[PDB]
Amino acid sequence: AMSYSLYGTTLEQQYNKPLSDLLIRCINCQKPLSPEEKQRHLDKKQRFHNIRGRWTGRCMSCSRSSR
Numbered sequence: 001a002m003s004y005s006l007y008g009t010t011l012e013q014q015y016n017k018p019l020s021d022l023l024i025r026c027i028n029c030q031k032p033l034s035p036e037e038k039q040r041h042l043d044k045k046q047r048f049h050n051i052r053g054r055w056t057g058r059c060m061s062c063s064r065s066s067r
């Protein structure tokens, strides 16, 4: 997130070389994230966020919020 985040594929360029080295995982399930899901995230996620030691994005999809 504020520490670091990937808005879309253009930002992916930094992680694109060592993305495997970089950690991407469910913010809460903490299960392996299929890079297929990350690829859509990288293709153009409304917001993919990076927290030190913790990564978030898809897990937000695991839960929903209502206004």
Ligand SMILES: [Zn+2]
Residues within 6 Å of the ligand: 026, 027, 028, 029, 030, 058, 059, 060, 062
């Ligand atoms: Zn999750």
